[PDB]
RNA sequence: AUGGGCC
RNA sequence: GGCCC
């Protein structure tokens, strides 16, 4: 978005310097072009004269203003997508109780009891369990007073900026391109879940191309469902965004909230309000307070779903701005936040759509190589979704999510102290789709030191998971 | 060091 | 706890 004000204040909000990710035995074997992100300005791996604080906020390059004609069209697309969305999900979108917003429901996982509480609770040295009882699903006086302010629509807040401790490419580590996490206060997350938690639960349960959303999917079993759907189409596009979250313009965000979360769709009047507080935000980083107009904070309850919804409307927006008679059945798509797969039988020109996306402040590029443009004829077996390829399994004839060996090597090369064993079993579930040989090679540095699941046992687990009958068929 | 999903 | 976003 657009940084409108940068003010220095005496109260310093500390960020986590020093990585918690340490090199494993695999690191010296695979030697990955990957490492922990830079969290300190004094990190020796950084390029000379590169200030980490400057790069972190470089993504805020402005807040695109839309004309009345573009806003009217966006409203049409948002309303059209909202129509489709609420037709599938239903309109039982009444507020969640405090209990259900903490403990979750079918399709909605419980609130994390031990994560960061946000501001100003972090300045008071308070943990999440001091404000909210996560066992019995009740709140303290601090949160209850804040919920009352949210009812009255008078609630104000700041976002706590944390540097994301994660593995990134050595190029990005050297460029100081550390991603940031905008931690929202716990009561905001609770109230958002109260306002739109039913809806979010319904979206997770009804994931697929019909609503254009993969939020809630299990790639192990859903790759077959998605793969067979997208293979039915003549053209498939792997569309990349840059700073997707940051580049949501206030116009687009506001209109989407207005069209999707209407009271006629069964929402409480405050659902629209609480989401609109994400448009213009105040961010606290160290001694600095930064006001930003536009963009979506990462730490909101429904960041992925909001991002997914917008992504759907953007594609419908872009196409209708260029072509005539474009409807929801003109194409098919699945998204998960900024990650997107688009398909159609019409020879659509995505290179021509570039400026139309730019009118929303979004920059689209092909994921497929550098290429120097979007091309036609690509199938689902060419594209990447959720860092996973679409490969056919030799033994079953089902689509399976295959990750790049280079990526798996990177993931395996680092871990937090004493979590290597638990991480190994978790990553094994991802590595099983690379085949027996690559599976053996990936875990070769770990042999005799940890327990590595056999390829056979995870393959049979997957077969049953993707389709129960296919596992029984290999017995008949 | 987070939201959300899945394991 | 890990992964994806």
Residue numbers in the entry: 1 to 476
According to the publication:
Here we describe a new mechanism by which foot-and-mouth disease virus (FMDV) can become resistant to ribavirin. P44S but not P169S was detected in a 70% proportion in R-Ap35, as evidenced by analysis of both the consensus sequences and their corresponding mutant spectra. These results suggest that the three substitutions in 3D were selected sequentially during replication in the presence of increasing concentrations of R: first M296I, then P44S and finally P169S. To identify possible structural modifications of the viral polymerase associated with the important alterations of the mutational spectrum in progeny RNA, and to investigate how these modifications can affect RNA binding and polymerase activity, the different mutant 3Ds were incubated with the heteropolymeric sym/sub-U RNA of sequence 5′GCAUGGGCCC3′, crystallized, and analyzed by X-ray diffraction.
In contrast, 3D(SSI) crystallized in the trigonal P3221 space group with the sym/sub-U RNA incorporated in the structure. The X-ray structures were determined to 2.2 Å and 2.6 Å resolution for 3D(P44S) and 3D(P169S), respectively, and to 2.6 Å and 2.5 Å for 3D(P44S, M296I) and 3D(SSI), respectively. The 3D(P44S, M296I)-RNA and 3D(SSI)-RNA structures are almost identical (rmsd of the superimposition of all polymerase residues of 0.22Å). However, the crystal structures of 3D(P44S, M296I) and 3D(SSI) in complex with the RNA template-primer reveal a rearrangement in the template channel with important effects in template binding, in particular, at position n+1 (nucleotide A3). The conformational changes in the main and side chains of residues M16 and R17 allow the opening of a hydrophobic pocket formed by residues of motifs G and F and by M16 that facilitates the entrance of nucleotide A3. In 3D(P44S, M296I)-RNA and 3D(SSI)-RNA complexes the re-oriented residue R17 points to the polymerase interior, interacting with the side chain of residues N41 (which lies in the same loop of the substituted amino acid S44), and with Y285. Nucleotide A3 appears also reoriented, flipped-out towards a pocket formed by amino acids M16, P117, G118, Q160, F162, V181 and V183.
